[PDB]
Assembly symmetry: D2
Homo-oligomer: 423 residues x 4
């Protein structure tokens, strides 16, 4: 009769077992490549997948395992695989179910890096990502073909801060027998558990809020385990010749996708996470709810402040009255639609430049989801790779300042942004 | 006036940071870097200015290691990756897209083989495995889709030494780069770029890192390969960078620039700055470790080669080894520190030995300071078919030793004691 | 006209400057022993203290410097020196102003380790620590002699959870021209800034709440800079022969004590903190307010829960109605008297053993101030070194369970402790 | 059947953790460790049971390093500390209380000298500095309060080699331990315990760690010293442990047990598990690095010893060096890799050289892989009076080189180029 722990317990404990050797309370940093095999048979068994155990950190690492289990536990997934980066998580999440010739439907409202991965890198690997305006559920529907393997959206458009109608998009995905992949980087499980809202697979840049401290690039893929792998995902339901005819759904049941992702993509492409990074991201995850609550409390107040400020044209934050995504925010992200939002100063690009140049507390850097408040001009930075049209479709605007509202004293954030605005 | 290898392994790429004057390479365990101005942020993203943008793309700790490996290999630049697998993936994906082919030696690390045969196959990249013993096979396998020839310096675990220069001439004849996975040699024992490689990849996990702590890969660009129409993504405007042409913007660093700006940035198989730091600590002693590794490997290989309980020992430096002359030509300091042997009594004896060694670590790795042992057929190359294993030089009785820097007398004793427990 | 940032901003930003080299937003881990000297003159200048700069990590490290400045900024001190441990902080805090033949007055209500340091280790170095019942201000007064160099108390007795009357004890210390040293480990600057309440010197086990994640042993000494070093502290006001007649108060002004502590004790005894530890403790400090707020919110609810529980004899938490320290809690620790408190089950030692043995979420380990909830029986563990009398005086009791209430879901903590109590 | 040094430096103290089977030593960056039961917690605190209690007291990563250094030195045990200074402090404070004396060579690292002369003096410990050249001075300085003789293996920066065995006989005659700070040699070059040391201390910061990353110290207990009435705290009930007698509970490990249980626990100059991890990575290559260090040092010392712009070179392995025979006797592999030289043109030339070297790192450290240079009189020993500096063998013109593992040709070139810039 196992205990159902709360989020705040899970973010601290989940996936974390006291190692039998040292009884270390902290998750050891298993900064190891390798692990002893007690016997040839055990080694053969580990590689044959006949026995669970550590083989090689590229495949699996006991530090990272904590983080994987922890995020899976927070999202309510069966499993997760940490990656070297959000981008690697996204890459893996797609490549796990999409091969050359396959298609993915993605919101156009993506982080520039995902957009580029989708538009360019995956394109070159024969994966055609069809970008849809996520505001138009029919566009998901229209873009799906026999070749579509997934719908991919961000919980909160980097940096459109649009909230896809997850359950509606999930319905579309599931109607077509394809998984719904939600990049939940902007929300974290604390603000949004996409699995509860139809996501089959959640990915994160753990770089951002999950890690929370701007220290560690990291990604993770969380498998809901909810998705029935069908004939559109032959590699999940057919003998994998690289594992002597292992069938992921047969061997791993509902964990097929995440098992495959580890056994195929993590192992083969090796976008593995450093155990050190895992450890640092774990230290972030330990305070995730606390951070995220402060982040969203601050984001609300900063967004409300900017929303009423006479030198600000607009503020794009779902929680602001009259935001297009307000009701989606209330439905899906009731704790607050993340802590990243955009605003357009009066004076446009030139005012934006001046603001970004005159904030002293906001950190002008390429990141979101640091405990520290971050500012950037997506058009020239995060989404610089996108064509004007792709930027436009990603919700990028020339005057747009993106704020990742940190957990600083809101009064300081307001003061900082106010002082910058008054210059 | 160039610094010697031993100096470079300690110093190359490592600058005293202007802030702290740290002698050690700081662990810049950061995601992000301040942009002084919106103009600077724009310039950085527009590649108008060098600087730190985001650790997925580049990191000053990792930069040291990249520059250092690039310096040791005599490459223009390098990009570190989360793993050797990612380095290999990136090395290929940088220049191969769906529809493309790569010619690879069959004598690969199982994981590379599997990446090539399966994962890349799913990305529309057909790796054609050739028998690297036969230069004609490289030539034969090349098509107008081939984008590279890929070999390991010393096949994991065949310990074959491709005829690098001859293979390089084939690649180059075909206007394709020769990629050498130099994991087993490190630049100390072999600098593939001096022998026709255009691109070197390492699992820095192995000897470069040397301590079994850190998964890491790197791709080193020789800078020598003239990217041609077979690599449009290097010589044609990149729509992801507003029609940047890598060869135009980066000259000889086109490949490695692209690899960072496209694959590292997009797929994000980035190395942890901490891993970079640890690998650096390995690299600092690379020549010392590798010299000891090879001194030990030779002794152990000689010991086992003479041993009444050992059927065979496969190490190029052993008299009569097929690859002996290639070892003399290409790895004169010693053909790495990994070799295989087959005990008399075959697989069963192999298991007894692996079970009986106390000092050798039974684990999946090579190129630890620690002596490692494994049975590749059931582990490292377990994913391969019998045929693939055979083509990879994996044999059922085969024990792979990664000869560490322990006291050779202990390693000999350990293996001797284990052997001397297997009945005649 | 520099900005007065809030606590939450400071815990994130204070002491942290973007390095000119890399512009890293995260505090680099300057895991270096050494630092380049541009010139013999610069090296000579650094060692002669004619120039600030990095010399050697044992003395100073730019990662640790952030943490030092940050804690100094949170406490409102002029400076801090991080140490390898709380114990080293305490050792240094004392040895910086007390030599063989000198005395210190300390509350008997100490962490066993401090008690032992005081009672034994310092005794052997000719420093006689006179232990007073801190409930009796007259006892501080009585125990002070010509030889007394300091009064030392914990903000919240480990594990008595007594609150000394800081300002009253400060008055006694200052009346005798000796500094008041407050071990603020249990509170952190978030709950209590001893410098605002008469402490001249604050020490912490940063191991505990400041670090917050149970990863890193670390201590720090924070100098208020408020204390006028007088003839009782010759080494602060007279030429230091180890620095060619440097006078700390002359060279360092109000930072004399902390400067000396670095230049003499840190340098000479070298209880220095790893830059890595500094980095990890910084990651804790970044969420300090958030953690501490959750900790105290949980501690209150758990203490209130245990305080009403029919299998609990007593709960010692200042914030519980009728606790002796309630008004001291309201005066000094209004945000909550830390998140560590003790309770005596009914059934005494035997029930305590059973509880400690049957908690599944509480971690039975020697630490406090982890994000994770911790449990231990001080009498047999943290204070095991103390004689029955010293334990008694430290507020240790045979039936006493000490809880470090973590930031888990209070419902889980309650459930855990309730389930343990019902066994 | 003992493992060789090279094996021990890689393996000693390192066990495969039962949980993960990590080959690498995990970084147990933990404060705390679960007690399975209140009984277990009680037993651990009551020292009825070995196990992990709290990282200030003991840590499984650090344990590896402690055991490893203890293994390399042939000690019973070791306790790592935050620094060499803390190791020295602990080594002394473990056996000296206020009122006690220590006899130390004057030829000390400035920081030790200063700890001894000032910090310990404030704790009522009178360190009597003797001229280690003259065995009689050790004898003369000993009083019934002396608790130890303390010397460095190779004086920082006098590079004098005490006559360890002769000094050990003096200490032992007086029933006091001989503590050798073996920082400059490491167990690879000198195992003081084999030459009469009872306690060895290191700055692991230096050669043991070898990479300039991590401040660390260790105290190694030979286990050989029979604690007597001059050490009541080792042979009398410890009131802090309910009358535990260290010699009774820990036998030959009394000292090192006490040091952990009293000084480490109470003063908490504990090493970061991360530092332990990094130092371990150094130690893994200790023999390799130290061999290269000494090979390089000899070459550099010979180069400078023959150099027309160098007045003197102080390195025991140089023909005519006062300590040559002691080098032959005690450090036959080479008297460490730190030496001094005085350029012709004295201090001014010294500054020119220090300013002019490009490869040598001007910084305060020794025993980095990197070659280091400094002017001790103005840096490392700056805190000492002229007299103390002189008694420490510090000279105004003196340049201390910590000869790294760079290519000797680069180091020679670097110093040659710098010298050849100083006018005759
Ligand atoms: Na600016
Ligand atoms: Na076995
Ligand atoms: Na139990
Ligand atoms: Na200079």
């Amino acid at each position: 009769e196992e205990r159902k722990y709360g989020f705040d317990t899970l973010q601290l404990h989940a996936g974390q077992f006291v190692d039998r050797e040292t009884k270390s309370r902290a998750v050891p940093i298993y900064q190891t490549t390798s692990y002893i095999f007690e016997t040839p048979e055990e080694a053969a068994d580990l590689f044959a997948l006949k026995k669970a155990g550590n083989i090689y950190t590229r495949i699996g690492n006991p530090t990272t395992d904590v983080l994987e289990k922890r995020i899976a536990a927070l999202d309510g997934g069966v499993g997760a695989v940490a990656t070297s980066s959000g981008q690697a998580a996204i890459t893996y999440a797609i490549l796990n179910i999409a091969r050359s010739g396959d298609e993915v439907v993605a919101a156009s409202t993506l982080y520039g890096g995902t957009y580029t991965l989708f538009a360019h890198t995956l394109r070159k690997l024969g994966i055609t990502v069809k970008f849809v305006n996520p505001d138009y559920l029919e566009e998901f529907e229209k873009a799906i073909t026999d070749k579509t393997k997934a719908i991919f959206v961000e919980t909160l458009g980097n940096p459109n801060i649009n909230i896809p109608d997850f359950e509606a998009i999930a319905e579309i995905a599931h109607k077509h027998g394809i998984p719904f992949i939600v990049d939940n980087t902007f929300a974290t499980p604390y603000l949004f558990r996409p699995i509860e809202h139809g996501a089959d697979i959640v990915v994160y840049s753990m770089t951002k809020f999950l890690g929370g401290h701007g220290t560690s690039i990291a990604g993770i893929v969380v498998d809901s385990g909810k998705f029935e792998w069908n004939e559109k995902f032959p590699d999940l339901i057919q003998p994998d010749p690289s594992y002597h005819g292992l069938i992921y759904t047969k061997e791993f049941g509902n964990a097929a996708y995440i098992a495959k992702l580890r056994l195929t993509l993590l192992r083969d492409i090796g976008a593995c996470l450093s155990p050190f990074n895992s450890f640092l991201v774990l230290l972030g995850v330990e305070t995730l709810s606390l951070r995220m609550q402060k982040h969203v409390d601050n984001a609300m107040k900063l967004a409300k402040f900017l929303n009423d400020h006479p030198k600000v044209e607009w503020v794009n934050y779902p929680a602001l009255e009259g935001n297009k995504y307000y009701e989606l925010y209330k439905k899906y992200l009731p704790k607050g639609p993340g802590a990243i939002f955009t605003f357009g100063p009066k004076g446009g690009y030139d005012a934006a430049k001046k603001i970004i140049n005159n904030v002293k507390l906001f950190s002008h850097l390429a990141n979101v989801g640091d405990a520290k408040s971050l500012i950037i001009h997506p058009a020239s930075t995060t989404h610089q790779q996108l064509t004007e049209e792709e930027q436009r479709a990603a919700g990028v605007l020339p005057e747009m300042i993106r704020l990742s509202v940190g957990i600083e004293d809101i009064e300081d954030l307001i003061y900082d942004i106010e002082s910058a605005l008054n210059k």
